[PDB]
Ligand SMILES: Nc1ccn([C@@H]2O[C@H](COP(=O)(O)O[C@@]3(C(=O)O)C[C@@H](O)[C@@H](O)[C@@H]([C@H](O)CO)O3)[C@@H](O)[C@H]2O)c(=O)n1
């Protein structure tokens with residue numbers, strides 16, 4: 085039988101492994117954070133830790149189609165504000181459906197708007213999860 | 215209806231993201247965007263795969279370069295790229311992507327590019 089139920093909070097990246105920058109960050113800051121946390125994206129939060137947006141590798145491509153010399157560009161000018169988030173109590177099986185339906189690759193995990201971690205497609209494809 | 219193998223589910227023909235060896239990074243961006251897979255393949259004139267370039271590659275490039283539009287794709291592409299044959303079971307393409315921590319696969323026959331597939335294609339086809 086199915087051994088145990090897997091929720092997003094069980095396999096999300098948390099603490100210092102969460103990719104996160106503030107509203108004052110630049111695109112350069114975003115790149116460095118994206119690279120460091122290995123999820124292909126970063127969240128952006130306000131001073132209270134509330135999620136304000138995300139910026140993905142795909143977002144970078146789209147930016148580079150319209151701008152050059154982007155290292156000092158404020159993250160707020162280029163991020164996705166109406167981003168998709170999930171609660172930690174979501175089933176992993178539910179999350180994978182959301183990635184498919186919304187055509188995205190990673191999810192910030194939140195509680196009351198407050199960022200608590202992140203997952204991506206590869207977390208959901210781990211052995212035994214689905 | 216038939217969705218067993220990679221060849222069944224891949225983007226193929228003109229839906230494949232592909233540019234030639236002579237292309238620039240600007241050409242790569244346009245193609246990456248147009249075909250919606252977050253990557254492009256690079257082929258020689260004969261249609262043989264020479265490399266790939268992904269959205270993650272672009273991040274890594276932007277960490278060490280600026281003003282990249284005119285840069286030749288050969289200078290930044292991944293040459294030793296992972297490829298699959300069309301005869302791969304679709305479930306096995308998922309397993310490769312997971313184990314290798316990659317997000318799309320060019321499909322080949324003896325190095326000749328025939329298509330490309332990513333995780334979203336597999337999800338949409340009911341593979342998982
Ligand atoms: N939790 C999330 C994750 C992503 N997004 C937004 O959704 C859009 C699509 O996300 P993406 O990660 O950029 O999606 C891409 C894309 O560029 O569209 C990336 C690309 O590498 C490739 O993986 C393709 C897939 O082939 C699916 O289209 O998908 C982006 O504007 C992003 O900021 C969001 O609102 N909330």
Ligand SMILES: Nc1ccn([C@@H]2O[C@H](COP(=O)(O)O[C@@]3(C(=O)O)C[C@@H](O)[C@@H](O)[C@@H]([C@H](O)CO)O3)[C@@H](O)[C@H]2O)c(=O)n1
Pocket residue numbers: 122123124125141189204206266267268269270271292294295296297315316317318319320
């Ligand atoms: N068929 C392929 C596909 C990709 N690659 C190469 O594999 C490397 C990783 O591919 P990526 O798509 O850039 O992979 C990323 C990356 O940035 O490394 C993207 C990011 O969304 C995220 O999915 C992370 C994983 O989360 C890391 O575990 O993976 C790249 O240099 C790419 O050229 C390859 O050789 N052959």
